[PDB]
Amino acid sequence: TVSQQYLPLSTACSSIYFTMESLKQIHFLYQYSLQFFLDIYHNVLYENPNLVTDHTQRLSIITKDLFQVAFNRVARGMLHQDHITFAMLLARIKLKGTGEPTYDAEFQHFLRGNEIVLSAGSTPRIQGLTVEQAEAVVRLSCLPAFKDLIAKVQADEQFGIWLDSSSPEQTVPYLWTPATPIGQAIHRLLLIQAFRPDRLLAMAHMFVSTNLGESFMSIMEQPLDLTHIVGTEVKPNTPVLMCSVPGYDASGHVEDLAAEQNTQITSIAIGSAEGFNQADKAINTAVKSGRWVMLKNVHLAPGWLMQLEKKLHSLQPHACFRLFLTMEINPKVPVNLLRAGRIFVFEPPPGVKANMLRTFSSIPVSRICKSPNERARLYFLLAWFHAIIQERLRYAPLGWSKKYEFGESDLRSACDTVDTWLDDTAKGRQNISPDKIPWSALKTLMAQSIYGGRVDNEFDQRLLNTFLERLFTTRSFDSEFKLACKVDGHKDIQMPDGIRREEFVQWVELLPDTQTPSWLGLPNNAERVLLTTQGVDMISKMLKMQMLETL
Amino acid sequence: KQSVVTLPVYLNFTRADLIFTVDFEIATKEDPRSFYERGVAVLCTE
């Protein structure tokens, strides 16, 4: 009875935990202990959505919830470059766990087809395919289901658009018997890798959408919900590790959570002997009473981190007590404390939509909603400008000549200046004409002091001034103001016509999931090499994965 | 001694070594704001 009811669940259990264990061969920031995985199980089996007294479908709910929450709790502490790899591996486990023909030969060609030997001296037609495309097609021609691809490419000579140029991830030509949709996705992914390697990430994303559901990775795009995670699913003796990339931190997030939950935190900066004594005293008092304690810049004392982890393991603390450790991602952090704690990686958000969502979540509602009624539109414009100039940093050195740090502090200063100048100009009036807004004051201040203070080059200053002059006029709040031109052919991201913060948030959420650097103003081909090398990095990480399974 | 677009000339593709500025002549329908935002520049070695 137990075998025929719950064997595949246990097989998926072992596979998922050993994927989590072998996951450390990527970035060394995360090492996961078995207690983490058993906490995931005690979340799944005892916090059950649709809690439906039918075991046959209840097991399916348990398995789906297992995959979803494993991805959630593991990818909250992983860089955005590896979310696709982890989701792909989870999809591989799900595929192996189901009547589906396991296409091991096709996955092997997908992974190590680049590393396999190919023919020499074979020069196919250069009618529409370059030498590397021809080499990839020759390498893929060894698959039994894909033999007459050389014939088929000139057979469909009119298919020079869905297989070359444009955005081929949606519709792909040619054919692999009525195939299972997952098998069609696998063959189409092989075609994408062979023809257009720059769309490999999008193709893998929609493969995961077809396999584990289209809303599998939607929770990564939303801003982090620290309140529920800290107050619900974190053990009191588990330190809340908050690792972050240079240029961005989490101390403000901890202070905001402290203010919201009405819990007092003693904040200590690590690096002095008095700081160490304060940290020990605060940790002991916190264990005795219960109030939270956060240690800052923790990565500067690994020798102290060793006995910090040992002391934390050897104590039984208060119920409502949490310890936060903010640090940068460094190799000096001990793997003991990396295993003991729970890791939340903090990085610049991916995409304009996620960036503006994070900004609007960060700013409280009472700040935006205050009189006059134009403050909401001004804050929306500021958020869009901040998101655009932050997202232009990824495509360096085209977006910016230097890798600046346009962090949250600059946005906070810009919001403060906007608020103060609005309060100066409007003497408590409910509405203000768009012509009377201090546009010159805002533009000059944010071009010379707040955002342009960090700018070195005159050309970068010119670019920032161009952005500020283009965005901070809007023909004085005219309707149908074009924020950008998403596609050269008939696509403009015009201004939302709403006047309220809720309307602005609804417009932000309703932005399409697609994004190209033409949103930012860059050429659409700026991201091509980055996406190609990121797909190659994903393939290399996967080869790192399955490797564990005279001069 | 005595629209137009001021294009920087960088030494290499890293664009960290500005050398000299060039004032080119724009076409009929192109726009200097688009030229600035798109990051058009001149490379010295590539």
Instruction: Count CA within 13 A, CB hemisphere, residue A176.
Output: 16
Q: State the Cα–Cα distance between residues A483 and A493, nearest whole angstrom.
A: 6
Helices A55-75 & A2-22 angle (0-180, nearest 10): 10
Mutate to test the interface with A, among B38, B40, B43 (most CBs of A within 10 A): B38
What sign does the CA torsion over B26, B27, B30, B35 have? Answer: negative
Residue A209 to chain B, least CA–CA distance (Å): 33
The three-state secondary structure class of A143 is coil
Task: Tell me which residue in A401, A457, A466 faces B37 most closely, judged by beta carbons.
Answer: A466
Residue B42 to chain A, least CA–CA distance (Å): 12
Query: Exposed, middle or buried, A161 (CB in 10 Å: 0-12/13-18/19+)?
Result: exposed
**Residue A44 CB neighbours (<10 A):** 19
Query: Nearest Cα to A468, choosing from A389, A415, A404?
Result: A389
The three-state secondary structure class of A234 is coil
CA B18 to chain centre: 11
Mutate to test the interface with A, among B37, B40, B42 (most CBs of A within 10 A): B37
Residues of B within 8 A of A467 (CB-CB) are 37
Q: How distant, in Å, are the alpha carbons of A26, A202, A350 from that of A79? A: 10, 17, 11
Q: State the Cα–Cα distance between residues A436 and A1, nearest whole angstrom.
A: 77
Q: How many residues does chain A have?
A: 551
Beta strands (DSSP E) in A138-265 are: 240-244
| Cβ contact A463–B34 (<8 Å) | no
Q: How distant, in Å, are the alpha carbons of A7, A11, A380 from that of A4? A: 6, 13, 56
The three-state secondary structure class of A392 is coil
Cβ proximity of A260 and A364 under 8 Å = no
What resolution does the deposited structure have, in angstroms?
Answer: 3.1
**Residue A528 CB neighbours (<10 A):** 15
Mutate to test the interface with A, among B36, B42, B44 (most CBs of A within 10 A): B36
Question: Is there a cis peptide before residue A168, judged by omega within 30 degrees of 0?
Answer: no
- Percent of residues in chain A assigned helix, strand, coil, to nearest 5: 55, 5, 40
Query: Nearest Cα to B21, choosing from B7, B36, B42?
Result: B7
Report residue A33 as tokens: 């202990």
In A113-159, alpha helices (H): 131-140, 149-155
User: How are strands ordered across the β-sheet holding B42-43?
Assistant: B18-25, B4-10, B42-43
Cβ proximity of B18 and B8 under 8 Å = yes
Q: How distant, in Å, are the alpha carbons of A114, A125, A403 from that of A120? A: 15, 15, 43
CA A454 to chain centre: 26
Task: Tell me which residue in A402, A457, A521 faces B38 most closely, judged by beta carbons.
Answer: A521
Cβ proximity of A520 and A391 under 8 Å = yes
| Cβ contact A457–B18 (<8 Å) | yes
Closest Cα in chain B to A459: B8
Q: How many residues does chain B have?
A: 46
Task: Tell me which residue in B6, B18, B39 faces A398 most closely, judged by beta carbons.
Answer: B39
| Cβ contact A466–B33 (<8 Å) | yes
| Cβ contact A521–B14 (<8 Å) | no
What angle is formed at CA A321 by the lines to CA A310 and CA A73, rounded to 5 degrees?
Answer: 80
Cβ proximity of A199 and A167 under 8 Å = yes
Tokens 């940093």 map to which residue? A393
Residue A487 to chain B, least CA–CA distance (Å): 14
Question: Is there a cis peptide before residue A372, judged by omega within 30 degrees of 0?
Answer: yes
Task: Tell me which residue in A402, A470, A522 faces B39 most closely, judged by beta carbons.
Answer: A522
- Percent of residues in chain B assigned helix, strand, coil, to nearest 5: 15, 35, 50
Tokens 């088929």 map to which residue? A152
Helices A104-112 & A528-546 angle (0-180, nearest 10): 120
Task: Tell me which residue in A399, A402, A470 faces B39 most closely, judged by beta carbons.
Answer: A399
Mutate to test the interface with A, among B3, B9, B15 (most CBs of A within 10 A): B15
The DSSP H or E segment spanning B21 is strand B18-25
Q: State the Cα–Cα distance between residues A299 and A297, nearest whole angstrom.
A: 6
Closest Cα in chain A to B34: A521
The DSSP H or E segment spanning A484 is strand A482-487
Whether chain A has a CB inside 8 Å of the CB on B24: the answer is no
Whether chain A has a CB inside 8 Å of the CB on B44: the answer is no
Report residue A95 as tokens: 């595929």
Q: How distant, in Å, are the alpha carbons of A18, A118, A421, A429 from that of A424? A: 60, 71, 5, 11
| Cβ contact B14–A397 (<8 Å) | yes
Cβ proximity of A106 and A186 under 8 Å = yes
Cβ proximity of A218 and A551 under 8 Å = no
Q: State the Cα–Cα distance between residues A541 and B9, nearest whole angstrom.
A: 38
Partners of residue A295 on adjacent β-strands: A268, A325
CA A379 to chain centre: 24
CA A67 to chain centre: 18
Q: State the Cα–Cα distance between residues A379 and A209, nearest whole angstrom.
A: 34
Cβ proximity of A209 and A177 under 8 Å = no
In chain B, alpha helices (H): 32-37
Closest Cα in chain B to A469: B33
Query: Nearest Cα to A224, choosing from A346, A327, A320?
Result: A346
Residues of A within 8 A of B6 (CB-CB) are 459, 462
Report residue A185 as tokens: 């996705």
Instruction: Compute, in degrees rounded to 10, the torsion defined by CA atoms A286, A289, A292, A296.
Output: -20
Please give the full DSSP string across A178-199, using - where no structure is assigned. Answer: ---HHHHHHHHHHHHHHH-GGG
Tokens 């740090």 map to which residue? A405
Q: State the Cα–Cα distance between residues A375 and B44, nearest whole angstrom.
A: 46
Q: State the Cα–Cα distance between residues A391 and A352, nearest whole angstrom.
A: 7
CA A109 to chain centre: 28
Q: State the Cα–Cα distance between residues A325 and A254, nearest whole angstrom.
A: 10
What angle is formed at CA A91 by the lines to CA A87 and CA A93, rounded to 5 degrees?
Answer: 120
Cβ proximity of A326 and A244 under 8 Å = yes
* DSSP label of A435: G
Q: State the Cα–Cα distance between residues A388 and A351, nearest whole angstrom.
A: 9
Q: How many CB pairs under 8 A join A and B?
A: 31
Residue B14 to chain A, least CA–CA distance (Å): 6
Q: State the Cα–Cα distance between residues A168 and A106, nearest whole angstrom.
A: 20
Report residue A472 as tokens: 């901070």
| Cβ contact A522–B37 (<8 Å) | yes
Round the CA-based radius of gyration of chain B to a whole number and report it: 12
Report residue A272 as tokens: 């002095």
Q: State the Cα–Cα distance between residues A35 and A15, nearest whole angstrom.
A: 16
Report residue A369 as tokens: 């909603």
